[PDB]
Amino acid sequence: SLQPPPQQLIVQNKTIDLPAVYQLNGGEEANPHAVKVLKELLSGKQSSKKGMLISIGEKGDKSVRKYSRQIPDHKEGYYLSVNEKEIVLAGNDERGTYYALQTFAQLLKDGKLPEVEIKDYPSVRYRGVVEGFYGTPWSHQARLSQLKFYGKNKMNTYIYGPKDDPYHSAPNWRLPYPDKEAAQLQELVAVANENEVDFVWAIHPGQDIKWNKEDRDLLLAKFEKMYQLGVRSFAVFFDDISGEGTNPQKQAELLNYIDEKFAQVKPDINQLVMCPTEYNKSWSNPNGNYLTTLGDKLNPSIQIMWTGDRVISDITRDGISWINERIKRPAYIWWNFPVSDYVRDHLLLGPVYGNDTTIAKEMSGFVTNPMEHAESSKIAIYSVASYAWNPAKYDTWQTWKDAIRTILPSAAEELESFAMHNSDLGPNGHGYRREESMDIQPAAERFLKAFKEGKNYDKADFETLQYTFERMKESADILLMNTENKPLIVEITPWVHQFKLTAEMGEEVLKMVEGRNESYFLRKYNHVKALQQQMFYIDQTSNQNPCQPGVKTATRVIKPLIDRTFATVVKFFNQKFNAHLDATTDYMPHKMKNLPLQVKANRVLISPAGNSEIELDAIYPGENIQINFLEISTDGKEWKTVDLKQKSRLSAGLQKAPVKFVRFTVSDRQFVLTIEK
Numbered sequence: 001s002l003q004p005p006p007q008q009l010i011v012q013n014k015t016i017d018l019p020a021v022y023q024l025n026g027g028e029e030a031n032p033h034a035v036k037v038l039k040e041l042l043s044g045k046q047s048s049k050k051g052m053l054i055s056i057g058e059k060g061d062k063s064v065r066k067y068s069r070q071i072p073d074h075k076e077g078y079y080l081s082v083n084e085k086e087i088v089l090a091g092n093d094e095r096g097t098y099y100a101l102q103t104f105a106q107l108l109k110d111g112k113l114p115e116v117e118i119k120d121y122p123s124v125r126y127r128g129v130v131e132g133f134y135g136t137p138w139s140h141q142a143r144l145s146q147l148k149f150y151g152k153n154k155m156n157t158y159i160y161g162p163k164d165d166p167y168h169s170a171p172n173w174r175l176p177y178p179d180k181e182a183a184q185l186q187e188l189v190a191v192a193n194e195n196e197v198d199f200v201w202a203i204h205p206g207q208d209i210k211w212n213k214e215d216r217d218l219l220l221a222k223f224e225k226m227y228q229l230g231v232r233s234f235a236v237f238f239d240d241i242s243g244e245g246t247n248p249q250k251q252a253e254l255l256n257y258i259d260e261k262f263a264q265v266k267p268d269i270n271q272l273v274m275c276p277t278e279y280n281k282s283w284s285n286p287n288g289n290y291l292t293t294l295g296d297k298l299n300p301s302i303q304i305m306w307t308g309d310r311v312i313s314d315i316t317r318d319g320i321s322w323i324n325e326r327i328k329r330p331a332y333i334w335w336n337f338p339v340s341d342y343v344r345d346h347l348l349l350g351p352v353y354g355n356d357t358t359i360a361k362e363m364s365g366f367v368t369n370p371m372e373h374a375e376s377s378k379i380a381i382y383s384v385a386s387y388a389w390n391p392a393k394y395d396t397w398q399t400w401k402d403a404i405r406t407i408l409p410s411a412a413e414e415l416e417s418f419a420m421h422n423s424d425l426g427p428n429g430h431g432y433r434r435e436e437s438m439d440i441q442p443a444a445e446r447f448l449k450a451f452k453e454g455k456n457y458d459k460a461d462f463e464t465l466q467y468t469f470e471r472m473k474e475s476a477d478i479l480l481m482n483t484e485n486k487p488l489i490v491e492i493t494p495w496v497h498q499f500k501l502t503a504e505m506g507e508e509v510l511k512m513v514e515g516r517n518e519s520y521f522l523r524k525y526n527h528v529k530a531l532q533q534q535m536f537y538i539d540q541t542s543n544q545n546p547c548q549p550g551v552k553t554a555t556r557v558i559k560p561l562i563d564r565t566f567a568t569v570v571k572f573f574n575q576k577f578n579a580h581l582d583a584t585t586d587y588m589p590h591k592m593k594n595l596p597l598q599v600k601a602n603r604v605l606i607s608p609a610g611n612s613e614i615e616l617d618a619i620y621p622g623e624n625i626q627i628n629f630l631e632i633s634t635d636g637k638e639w640k641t642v643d644l645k646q647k648s649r650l651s652a653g654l655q656k657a658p659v660k661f662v663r664f665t666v667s668d669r670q671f672v673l674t675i676e677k
């Protein structure tokens, strides 16, 4: 179950016991970070000249002289061997020896090891994570846990650049970090050194940069300050800006100046990376030369980032050849998944897939932009680690499961059950979607076809939907009480509650389908109406972010099935008993075309596309109104007019006037009312 899978592996079907007495060779000349891991696995057991020999070292150390032809000639490569007589842990360099110990740890199970020989190295030079999303940046504790996660999975790159960090971007990118933040970054560097991770500190100055010597010197003095805190890798981001910062000639000259007077003057600087203004094909200029200007001017040692054909996209062979021909070097991939800062009411916990597995030679690096929930991003981050190290053997679904069993061994099935139905994005401006609920979709669709048109449904499909809802409630309850990874549970709790209510509503709707007598039907109908109101309450109190507030879950297949079945059986009931039950699926306290009202924060809106009127559930102080292509009231009858101001964009302030009724009548497609709460 080795992850990432080695490049060469030979297994024997013999097993040996971890030596109760051993003899260590090279503990004083091999990588201290590797030796530490090794003595943790050996602790309690006896060290002496007598007993089984264990040899650790880098190529060149006396300890591994006998094995120098077995060691691959690759950066961060290594050689591992286990048999009845000895154990050999030999890297090509110090990082190779560490990675050798990471594979060693997985092999050890029940104090036993397999007789095995491994020769291994990475297909992609730089592999890791870039924290470059919009929203609440990762807490200090989350980042400490991230960096240890990367070393176990042989990730060698952590790029720091949260967009909402003011000392990284606007407005204070010229200012050194305050003492509290500086000591915290100094600890992150230490921890990342211990885990063999390059800490890349980025800076995002392009929105108000001036191409003079004052800003150029200040950017360097900040880089020097970051250097004093330990940083040895650096990046400059020019994404999502307007104005003079988009000049490719000035951008290249700045990065070349950083190379020659900073990166070439220090003794120990590693990566130097920049992100271009045009960072995807769809947004580049055909009548232009931005990318060819960078490609010709940028020093060859400086990397250039790229998200692919679009802002959210999969990386193909056509797409990477399109950019490599222009920038005149292999691209440094910035892959925007599972980042969710444009769909903040969803969790994206599905598998990693869609990236070509034969283009390892065509890319300098590969980093994933994750979500603001750090522990939840581990599922996809684990998969990127596997993909980037050995793409030729990358198995999508098997790594998704292996990730889940590593993140939460105590309740892995319960978490897989949760993630299976929390992976799609819903409709979004990028048109980027993922698979969800694929195992139950066939039976779901067959049940609803037959149900809508009087035919009998297969009893097996009906039982498959009952089995689903029942297991959903098991996982929700078990996950909420799980203390193995308390940070993970805290992140997902609002979705876990909504998950459970979805499942309860599902069971009640299926009982409406069975529908024995009239009295039972109305009982289940009233219970569904209560569950709807409960889902509304969570949606309005939990995760009230300023962008897409609320909580959505199981949206691709499960929620449409429950809503469509509820609407259908309610209409059959009204036809049979001549009744007038409400068939609407989402609770809404306000009232009144078929466009439903929405409540987002303190806003009340109509969904975008004598006359008509909106009635609130009470009186509220009014703030403003916005319409895009006349009167208000508090009791219905006594109205009053306020006029609008145009600039498509009609606005008007209410200035705290009491309001309950709003009307538009016949005078000269968003439509929003903002109130005070």
Ligand SMILES: CC(=O)N[C@H]1/C(=N/OC(=O)Nc2ccccc2)O[C@H](CO)[C@@H](O)[C@@H]1O
Pocket: 132, 133, 134, 163, 239, 240, 275, 279, 307, 311, 334, 336, 339, 341, 342, 369
């Ligand atoms: C290079 C890159 O991806 N930049 C940002 C990025 N921005 O892409 C945009 O949506 N760009 C944009 C679109 C409209 C207005 C302003 C910027 O995409 C990622 C996914 O949202 C964000 O996390 C990144 O910070």
Ligand SMILES: *CCC(=O)Nc1nc(OCC)c2ccccc2n1
Pocket: 134, 240, 341, 342, 546, 547, 548
């Ligand atoms: C919820 C507020 C919001 O949408 N913030 C946000 N801003 C930007 O761009 C700011 C220039 C953004 C870009 C890409 C993805 C998400 C984003 N969110």
Ligand SMILES: [Ca+2]
Pocket: 029, 030, 031, 057, 058, 061
């Ligand atoms: Ca050495």
